[model samples]
Structures are given as C-alpha cells and as structure tokens.
Target chain A: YFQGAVVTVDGEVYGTYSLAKDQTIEIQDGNRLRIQNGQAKMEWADCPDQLCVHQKAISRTGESIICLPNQVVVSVQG
Target chain B: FQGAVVTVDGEVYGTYSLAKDQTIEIQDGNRLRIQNGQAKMEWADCPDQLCVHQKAISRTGESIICLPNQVVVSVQG
Candidate 1:
C-alpha cells in the first residue's frame, strides 16, 4: 500500500504528502494541521469553535476529519 | 512580448514580466505571489487557507481561489 495521503480542501486537490515523515499543513486563517506517527490531527486553529481540535486523529485510508467553521478537511488516502 | 498577466475578480490587475518577482495585494488581507513564471496565493485572511496551499500556476487557465471571499488569482501568458 502507498504510505501517503492525498489532501483535498474545499473540493480542490492538493496532491499528496508522505506519512513516513512528520509534516505541518497550514490552512487559511492561520490554522495548522500536523501529520505524524502515521496519523493526522488538527494541531491548532484560529477559528472561534474548537470542534476540530476535539476530533480524533485519522490514519487509515478513506478516513477524514472535517472542520466546518474553517472549511478545512483532511482525509487519509493510501 | 509579456511574461504573464494577473487577474482578480474579472478585472486586470497587471501585466508583468516573469523575470521580476512581485506581490499583488487583493484587499482584505490577501496577497498573491508571482515569480519565475508562476503565480500563487501567498496569503489569505479567510479561514481554511486553501488558496495558500494550492499549487502555483504558470500555465494559462490555472487559478487559485478563495471561495469565502470570492477572490480568484489567475495567471495568463
């Protein structure tokens, strides 16, 4: 299986990122998402609601985390 | 001959030579970066920063958009 994930934010495709090494993705409004340990989570966000931070980290293919207020979505793809 | 043209909200922002790197300000704290024949959304004030994460555009028909604010940055030859 491929060890990377394809990122799509607001219906726009953003290619892929390797799961082997940790990486930080910054979205609009200064929010940050971190990928590490084969999982991804919302590290921080500037939005008023903290719902995204409370969501569970995802690693398996087809899994996803959505932050509605910020319009940011991170999906796990193999 | 021109290097590239920048457009915002259907209006012409400017036409610049790719040899010079420059920045375009799109009101509301948005900025567009143009360099080396490529254009990209360098920064956006809107939530989700999707525009900033999009790949740079060097070819015609390539654009970076900020949906919340209705901002579109496009590069043209």
Candidate 2:
C-alpha cells in the first residue's frame, strides 16, 4: 500500500527509504527505522517514554511514525 | 480548575484554564487547544509539526513540548 517513506530529522529531510528493501536507518544517536512488508516502524527511540517506539507502523498514505522528542518523522507515501 | 501552563523559550507565556473548550494561540503559529478537558497541541507552523502531533495532556505532570519552537504546554490544576 506504500511505495516509500520520507524521513525527517529536526525539521530537515533525512532521506527517503523504500519499502521494498529491508533495512535499518540510524536516526541520529538513538532512533532507528525498520522497513518491512511495505511498512515502516520505529524499532527503537531515545526518548524517555518511547512513545514513537511504541507507535504503530506506517503503510497507508499520510500515515507516519513520529518521534516528537527527537523530531523524527517517517511519513508513508503511496 | 483543570488548566495548563504555557511557556516559550524558557519564559512563561500565559496561564489558561479549561473552563470551556478554547484555543490558546502563541507567537509563532503555535496553537494549544483545550478540548473536552484535555490540552492538546493542535497546530504549529514548524516543518516537522512534531508538537502538533503529540497527544493531548489531561493528567497532572502531563506535558507537550516542542523543542524546535521552545513551546511547552503543561497540564496543571
């Protein structure tokens, strides 16, 4: 349902990761992104509450994995 | 008196109470909304909009902090 996801860090464009490939992105020091099954999830986070770490994966358009503390967002694009 | 304390750049901006649902607008396109007894970061002009995405805060010690804008909305009553 999704082609790729745009990664943003601290209001800047980090990169665009495709769902077809399974890989992990190092979001600065303590955040990570794991892509699989045409979706993405926050494998881990540095935030105290792990809010984004516990957030659901993204697949549908406009869906996103947001780590507010780190200002990281993985927005899914169809 | 359930309400919130707002601050920006390490300075107190204003104190608001949720007597009724309302929006507390800030200087830099920061919008804090009091809805149904919860204070939520409804809108912000930042590129990431992380603050806007944070969940509403209703319980004591709950807060929504946006680092880029230095905006913190804390639930205190």
Candidate 3:
C-alpha cells in the first residue's frame, strides 16, 4: 500500500527511492537512511542526540521524520 | 511589525510580543523562547536536540520545529 519515499535536505527534494528495493542513502556525516520491508527509518546518525533513530517507522503517505541538526527529512509519499 | 504565535500539534499555544522576551511551555517535553523578534527552542526533553539547535527565526515564514514532541514555533504578523 506504499508507493515510494522522498528524501529532502534543507527543505529541498534530494531524490526518491522505492521501498521494494531495500536501499540506504547517505545523508551526511555518518547519518544514513534505510528503506526496508516497505518502511523507512533512520538507520544511523552522527548527530549528538540521535532522535531521528528513535522515531517510529514510517510507511503511510504524509508521514515524516526530520533530523534538525543535519536538516535531513524523510517522508513517505505516493 | 507584529508578535508571534506558538503552536503545538496544530493547536494555538499562545501569542506574545516580539519586542520583549517570553517563554512558552508547550508540554513536558517542549519549551520555546521568543526574544528580540526571534523565536527559538530553548529546551526540550526529546532525545534529539535538532530543534534546539535550529537557528532563531524572526521572519514571517521562519519556524523552529521539534518533531519528536510535535512542537512548532512560527513568526507571524
């Protein structure tokens, strides 16, 4: 029931990734985003707080996770 | 030219003057500060400090958001 993912940095769209492929994108520093099992979550982050890693997995359209220190945003979109 | 408003989970928390300083407690995990026409996240209990580190905003479109706590502070007219 999910289409794909949109990754943004500093409010600009960086790229799109499909959930079926189960891939990872390097955002910055050691921060990385992982797409697997049709869900998107922060796999690793170099930020001091690591709050993005604690966010709930996102799979529905409009759901999003934002890493403020790095200005990285991951959203589920159709 | 005007004051600012604080919003938590899309609800209005409060509106205060931009010329002076003020503090807003959105909830247990979120706290905001507004001073000298700029708004910033002063403190938060959320694991991430991203929102706390966000630059202070003084313009109409500028905002500071704490995603984990669903707290947003925006400058408005």
Candidate 4:
C-alpha cells in the first residue's frame, strides 16, 4: 500500500503517490499539489483532470474529485 | 486465541486462527490428502494455488509460505 494515497485535482482523480512529507507535485493545468500535515492541497491546476477547485476536504475514508482534463484521485487514511 | 501469522523466510505474510486438536499441516512442494481440521488457504493465489498448501495456525512462530504470492503466515512467537 505504498502508493495508497490518491490525488484529486479539480474534480478528477489522477495517479497515486507513496508516503512523503512537505513535497509538491505539479500537473497539467495550473494546479499544483502539495503535501502537508498528512493532507494534500491543490495549490494550482489547469482543471484538466476534472478536479474540483475547492469544494470539500477528504480524509481517511473519504475521497476528493476534480473534473478537469488530466485526472485526479485523493483519499484519506486512518 | 491459537492464532498464527504466515511468514516467508522470516517476514510475516498473513494471520489466522485455529481450533482445538486441530492439525496445522503444510504442503511444501508435496501433495497431501485431507485428513481433518479447519484449514484455510493463507498465501494461495490464482496461479498454482500452492498457498492453500499450508494448514491452520497452531503454535506461535509457526508459518506457511507461498513463493507464488510472496506471502508468509506465522503464529506470534
């Protein structure tokens, strides 16, 4: 379950990433993903992965969705 | 609770519980028959199904490994 953590852009889910801290990953759109406090923030994205800009926050048993171009999927952990 | 965790070499793969007077047998590259007891396939996969070769978890530290699934079952030592 290394890459068990998913990343959601605008409202779409992209790929997954391993456990990390204080790191950032950029995507297609003007969206930038940042990991902090065991949480992910879409600093910016072009809304290509269908990811939602800012709606709700997902955690452990929850998920984040973005409806843009690329694709994003984010989930929380327990 | 008479439970065991399966292991490979020395790493744990999975865990399970057993009943009293149960026979915790393991089929390591061998073909055996069903004598009797609550048996569960710990490391078995869709490939050769060799994981099912191992039997119940009787004692601690006892394990069942399946090279195919990269799984290991051993009881708490």
What are the lDDT scores of the predictions, listed in order?
0.63, 0.73, 0.71, 0.42
From the highest DockQ down, the ranking of the candidates is 2, 3, 1, 4
**Higher-scoring candidate on TM-score, 2 or 3:** 2
DockQ of each: 0.02, 0.12, 0.05, 0.01
Proportion of native contacts kept per candidate: 0.00, 0.00, 0.00, 0.00
Residue by residue across A33-74, what tens digits does model 3's lDDT show? 999998888988887767677776777664556565576767
Q: Estimate each model's TM-score.
A: 0.46, 0.56, 0.51, 0.34
**Worst window of 10 by summed lDDT in candidate 4 chain A:** A59-68
Report how far off residue B10 is in candidate 1 (Å).
22
Tens-digit lDDT track of model 3 for B1-77: 56666655555677777788888777788777887777778889987576777678765534566656656565656
Those runs of model 2 whose alpha carbons end farther than 4 Å from true positions after fitting are B1-20, B24-34, B37-77
Residue B54 lDDT, candidate 2, scale 0-100: 69
For model 2, the docking class works out as incorrect
- For candidate 4, what's the RMSD? 16.0
- lDDT tens digits, residues A1-78, model 1? 666655555556555777777999877764678889988888888767565676667775544455544545565555
- Poorest lDDT segment (10 consecutive residues) of candidate 3 chain B: B59-68
Candidates ranked by lDDT: 2, 3, 1, 4
Q: Against the true structure, candidate 1 has what lDDT? A: 0.63
RMSD of each: 14.1, 6.4, 12.5, 16.0
Candidate 2: fnat, from 0 to 1? 0.00
Tens-digit lDDT string for candidate 4 (B19-47): 43333334343221212323345333336
Model 1 iRMS: 13.2
TM-score of chain A of 1: 0.83
